[PDB]
């Protein structure tokens, strides 16, 4: 039950190191690190192991795909993607984990790929509406969320989602403000679009967004501006770890209470990070 930090960049490198964080004693610790320095790659939870999907090793942006399991402390390449992807979303749905958009080397896609762990195979779904790198991707009421990005050309306050049982993308409400390189959790039944960057400034701000009533609101803002941070829910409250404020990588971590809508710093991590990963297990 902690909160991984998996690879990013600290401001001169991209890194394969990983780190882990207990609630409990409010201390992060590394853990073995990813077999290849990685950094703007997605993150999954499935099956009681982390998946650390594509992104940028400092030179090339990847296809490749490692997963690591606690228990043994140890990290094996899997399948790897039909498309080298760096910036995708990542997302856990009906067993499987979606990589969403990203940038393949040479242009931000609109495609979809599904993994499915029992027979280590990707396979092509539905792409997007609208191609999107550096959007944030949300679980909720069994659908997916793929939310804001870059489309090439402009960064974009369009959110989409995604029904497995009928393999269809559609608009939804859009963002308060365009956001790339923002995180997005689900807690209370709402997905929180964390931060990011509206195409001219890195943000501070906050929004949440109920499916009931397909609408966003904006609510307490971060302590600082952040841009490409990983978030994380656990305990009941979001987690935004590390990122980018505009002029440096940071190795603050905060975290919020939507009961008092307030955020407050823990434990900064052992290195500064922005572009991670992070995950919960």
């Given at each position: 039950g902690?909160?991984?930090?998996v690879?990013?960049?600290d401001g ?9 964080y207990?609630?409990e004693?409010?201390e992060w610790r590394?853990?073995a690190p990813?077999?290849?320095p ?8 499935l099956?009681?192991?982390i998946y ?7 030179h090339?942006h990847?296809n490749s795909?490692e997963?690591?399991?606690?228990e043994?402390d140890?990290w094996?390449?899997?399948?790897p993607?039909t498309?080298?992807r760096?910036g995708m979303g990542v997302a856990?749905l009906?067993?499987?984990?979606y990589?969403?958009g990203?940038?393949d080397?040479?242009t ?11 027979t280590?195979?990707?396979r092509?779904v539905?792409?997007?509406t609208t191609?999107?790198?550096g ?9 997916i969320?793929?939310?804001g990005?870059?489309?090439?050309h402009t960064?974009?306050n369009?959110?989409?989602?995604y029904?497995p049982?009928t393999?269809?993308?559609r ?6 403000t365009?956001?790339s390189?923002?995180?997005?959790a ?8 964390v931060?990011?960057?509206?195409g ?11 499916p009931e ?5 904006l609510?307490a803002?971060?302590?600082t501006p952040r841009?490409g ?10 987690y935004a ?8 990588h ?7 209470d939507?009961?008092?809508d ?9 290195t500064?990070?922005?572009g991670?990963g992070v995950?919960?297990?």
């Amino acid at each position: 039950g902690h909160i991984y930090a998996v690879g990013g960049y600290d401001g001169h490198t991209h890194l394969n190191s990983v780190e882990a964080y207990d609630p409990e004693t409010d201390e992060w610790r590394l853990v073995a690190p990813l077999t290849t320095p990685r950094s703007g790659m997605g993150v999954a939870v499935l099956n009681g192991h982390i998946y650390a999907v594509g992104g940028y090793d400092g030179h090339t942006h990847l296809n490749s795909v490692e997963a690591y399991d606690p228990e043994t402390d140890e990290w094996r390449l899997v399948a790897p993607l039909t498309t080298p992807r760096s910036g995708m979303g990542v997302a856990v749905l009906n067993g499987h984990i979606y990589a969403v958009g990203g940038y393949d080397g040479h242009t931000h896609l609109n495609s979809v790929e599904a993994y499915d762990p029992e027979t280590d195979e990707w396979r092509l779904v539905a792409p997007l509406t609208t191609p999107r790198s550096g959007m944030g991707v949300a679980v909720l009421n069994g659908h997916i969320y793929a939310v804001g990005g870059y489309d090439g050309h402009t960064h974009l306050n369009s959110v989409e989602a995604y029904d497995p049982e009928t393999d269809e993308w559609r608009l939804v409400a859009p963002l308060t403000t365009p956001r790339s390189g923002m995180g997005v959790a689900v807690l209370n039944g709402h997905i929180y679009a964390v931060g990011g960057y509206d195409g001219h400034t890195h943000l501070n701000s906050v929004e949440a967004y109920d499916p009931e009533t397909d609408e966003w609101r904006l609510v307490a803002p971060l302590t600082t501006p952040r841009s490409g941070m990983g978030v994380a829910v656990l305990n009941g409250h979001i987690y935004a770890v590390g990122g980018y404020d505009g002029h440096t990588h940071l190795n603050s971590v905060e975290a919020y209470d939507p009961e008092t809508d307030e955020w407050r710093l823990v434990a900064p991590l052992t290195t500064p990070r922005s572009g991670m990963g992070v995950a919960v297990l």
